[PDB]
Amino acid sequence: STDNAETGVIEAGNTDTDFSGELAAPGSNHTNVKFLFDRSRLLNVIKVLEKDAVFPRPFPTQEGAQQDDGYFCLLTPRPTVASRPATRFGLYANPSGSGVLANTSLDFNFYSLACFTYFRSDLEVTVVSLEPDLEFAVGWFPSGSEYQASSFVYDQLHVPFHFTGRTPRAFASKGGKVSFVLPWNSVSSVLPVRWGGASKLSSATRGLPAHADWGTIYAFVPRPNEKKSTAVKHVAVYIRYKNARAWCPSMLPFRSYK
Amino acid sequence: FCGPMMARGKFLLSYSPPNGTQPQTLSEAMQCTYSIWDIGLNSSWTFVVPYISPSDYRETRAITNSVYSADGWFSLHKLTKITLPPDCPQSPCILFFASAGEDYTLRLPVDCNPSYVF
Amino acid sequence: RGNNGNMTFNYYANTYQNSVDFSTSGILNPLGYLK
Amino acid sequence: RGNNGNMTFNYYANTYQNSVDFSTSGILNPLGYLK
Amino acid sequence: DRVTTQTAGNTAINTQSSLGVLCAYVEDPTKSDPPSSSTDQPTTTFTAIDRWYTGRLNSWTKAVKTFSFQAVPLPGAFLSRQGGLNGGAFTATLHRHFLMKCGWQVQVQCNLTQFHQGALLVAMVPETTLDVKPDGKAKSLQELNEEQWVEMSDDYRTGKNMPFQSLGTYYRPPNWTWGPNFINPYQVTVFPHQILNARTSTSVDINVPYIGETPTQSSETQNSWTLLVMVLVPLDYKEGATTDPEITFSVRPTSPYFNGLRNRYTAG
Amino acid sequence: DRVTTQTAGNTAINTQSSLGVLCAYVEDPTKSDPPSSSTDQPTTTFTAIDRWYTGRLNSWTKAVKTFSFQAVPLPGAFLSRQGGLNGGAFTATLHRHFLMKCGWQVQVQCNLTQFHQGALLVAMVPETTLDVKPDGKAKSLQELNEEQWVEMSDDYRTGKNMPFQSLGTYYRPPNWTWGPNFINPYQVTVFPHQILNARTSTSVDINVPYIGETPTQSSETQNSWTLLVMVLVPLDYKEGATTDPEITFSVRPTSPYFNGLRNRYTAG
Amino acid sequence: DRVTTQTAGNTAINTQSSLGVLCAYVEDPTKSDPPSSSTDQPTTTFTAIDRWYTGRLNSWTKAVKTFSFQAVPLPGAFLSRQGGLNGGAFTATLHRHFLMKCGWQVQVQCNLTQFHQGALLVAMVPETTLDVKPDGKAKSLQELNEEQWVEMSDDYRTGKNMPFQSLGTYYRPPNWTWGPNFINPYQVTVFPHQILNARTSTSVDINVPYIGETPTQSSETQNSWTLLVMVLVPLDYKEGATTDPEITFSVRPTSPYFNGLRNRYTAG
């Protein structure tokens, strides 16, 4: 039917608008935002700590630095690099060379349907072992907080301070899993799926949000430093969005024709 | 229509449900669901593709070609050639948009295709 | 609601199971209006 | 009913435990009638 | 009808081919309350800043390709005077406050003729970094003038070229393949917009409310809204017709709230 | 007003320069009753035949002279597929019934420009043999394509060339001087019609009811209505303007009644 | 009583030995609503298709063995003209629609004598592929004529010979031992049916409603109902009695709904 798309508004019609027919009855409400994002998906795979760690230093990190890489998981669907917020998402097509291969993550599913600018929800976290008969624990600190390093000595054994604290620590049974829900805890009101600002007035990276996350989790072995092993253990981190809400329509990623 | 305002012309938009062979001729298109669009003051024309299916739901992805995942074709024919006055650009362009009709519904969330990141 | 089929019971209080905004004290609407 | 002896409780809502048709809005009968 | 005159302060903009004003999200994007994140009495609208500010954009030529664009950051353009956009008292107030919250009313002007053809998509896009170069620096007035229009490319469609922090020599430099600030040119009509089609009008109007990840934002760094002008159908005309039609725009800040008064901003 | 969209079945035709629909003889040429001459229950309208069928006519050029014309027999054109006029289920039903009664809604499309000049008379003419050659045979699709437009001549103005029975050798062949099926070009506006003037519209609409010497008629031979397109003012334009504007038409059978169902018609 | 005359359109079939009409599943298999899976106004019954179409089947002889059969696919038989079953306007409409939903009323005619003996089971069978050869191709009119009657065999009783997709050289060809489209000859009376016993009647009538895995189905490929004629007791008679009694059938589509009008179906 006659219209003018230049207006910026085009009404959705049906078979009977210009032709002869009727409306098809509604088949489902699966496009409902709350229902759609309310399901677990893989966020990242991290190594399990077997001693107190040294949190990765800020960028740019110079050669010779002593730190633990691939252990901390930033809870966010946004791109991350080496446990920190990121803008560009990267991977390694040529894993051959010199230098540490930074861990990167991205909620692929989230962005394939994130046709909006802002998002908010509580976060259900599930940690699954990728190792046989593993006994591990999970640690977590809020957005804006940090990992408490070092350790204390009990009976000449070094026990990392990450065994204690005021934040959630979940000890799984041998071969078991860990699961719990966290509240939106960032100081921001909503999470910017895409962002155009800057978190600092000087030497800031445009588009890089400072606290677009639900905090950080890590996994460790309920054993003292001394009883350390040599074989690196891995654990998978799953997240689920509870009571999700979204604002300001936006685009979905470009699909190549090649 | 994004040609000049002095332009005139008519188009025939048609939708054909599945057939053994895809229609090509104006005579064939004209026998399916169609509407004739006249170029003039108003620049646009919306065309609703009726939902004509054997099943109450249809496949979103044509993994295998069937009457449940492929529902025919939409085609645009120029009915009467575009007429322009002297000193007017030739070959006017027609912008195409697609959207869900008011009774459009989606069912069963599936895994995403992560390739947009490669 | 969301992807939740539990009609019956809620063991933990709303303020613990979920976060709620602090106070400062079907029908799908359009996201654009032509005026 | 079916092969179900649970008279008591249903934890999950009917629309989650089962699928239901969307709307378009003892005595065994014969399958054939002679007219 | 198609003839309208919008007044604001000692300002008035007329058009004789209005398509109406596209209001984003709510019927009156002008209704807004003070930010809940600041306890100081804010500075609100006063007549010297309740008006339209007008600036220029680069001309449209036959050579500009489909999906090529120009972007105007808000309030960024006021701060850099892009297109000669001097915000008078608005900028003076902006420079003296840590925080600023406001909406925008914008009109893009570009007259063609009944003998020209082509179409521009004019949209207000939330949270973009289209005004920044991949190296992280904001495009200078000179750089904007040298390029005229930014060509759509794999980098932009991918977000592969958005600003980022270099990792340092400690890390193997990764292959950047995507970014959340990408632009899918085919979906730019999802945003509040109007299309400036040579055959239907010489202007477009959009009215948007304040948005942000927080109740209010840093004056000097926010960029919640960006005026985007993108070619959908290449410009064309016969010899003799006026060439390179110009493009201008008018912007009016609406329901502004300024918080955190201090001495003029000075770069560190 | 001038912008209309006429729906019928899975069909819809739009125009942005309507002059209104010229209804012949009665306010609603669509009202009609079953034929009193057949006792069998008729087949009436069903959705697959309640629609517009569209076909082509030969293009209009500067060379076509005043009063030259093109004719479309109804339902004849459906039977021969003149202009690519395939009547789908309508023709299939027509071929299987001895009798058929119906009216017609027609629209002729031909867009020009504000810089072209010329006028076509579009009329629905009752009881003509304009689709037949003087030798009695119907013009084939090839013959229509070779001539393009039929020139007005003394023969047509006189009816001198209409089909007839040769008398035989027993009689002296007479001088044929006139025929009742003549065409007085100056009076073609007496019929239901509209004029397609380059300066006023790109289409015309006519709506006529069933007519005939009897309540219903033979499907295969009737020709109570003929769509006539005749030049009143020669086409003209300056070098550079689009040449040879095309002409198309849409036809919709209204309130049809079919009687005498049988196997498909087969020529004897 | 036993004498009945069933009228439909310009059609009427009489019998003087009716056993009554066997209605499947519901008291009135004729009641039916439009398909919920199509938003376009359907084409429904019109008088030219509300009638009985009659065709032939191969004659019954003393040589036809127990459980040998003949099958008539519906609407397939209309499409291939099996037995001379030309569906007039029904087929013409069928060929022009993507979808079609309908029920069927059928009568099988076969008169014998009070001196003949033998019995035929006449049933309407849902969802079969009895009209297809094991290689996947539909039996041609010539193939049906060469075999006359299909003999019951291990293949049919097993479904071992139904159409299938060959796996390809990548796979070891398996031993096909069974198929869901098998036929257990002893249980064919489970379907809507009547028995044509030489001693009791010269005809049988069955009336079935629409069925299918979906609200409506593809015109060109559906085969929800198949008319099955199978020998239960071999034909026999003494020398002098009429030999090879003929078999004919009449079919009437009921409450049809056609959706998705388009140009005539053309094989790809």
UniProtKB/Swiss-Prot annotation, chain A:
Annotated compartments: Virion; Host cytoplasm
UniProt region (Interaction with host receptor ANTXR1), positions on chain: 88-99
Subunit: Interacts with host entry receptor ANTRX1.
Primary role: Forms an icosahedral capsid of pseudo T=3 symmetry with capsid proteins VP2 and VP3. Together they form an icosahedral capsid composed of 60 copies of each VP1, VP2, and VP3, with a diameter of approximately 325 Angstroms. VP4 lies on the inner surface of the protein shell formed by VP1, VP2 and VP3. All the three latter proteins contain a beta-sheet structure called beta-barrel jelly roll. VP1 is situated at the 12 fivefold axes, whereas VP2 and VP3 are located at the quasi-sixfold axes. Binds the host receptor ANTXR1 for attachment and uncoating (entry).
UniProt name for this protein: Capsid protein VP1
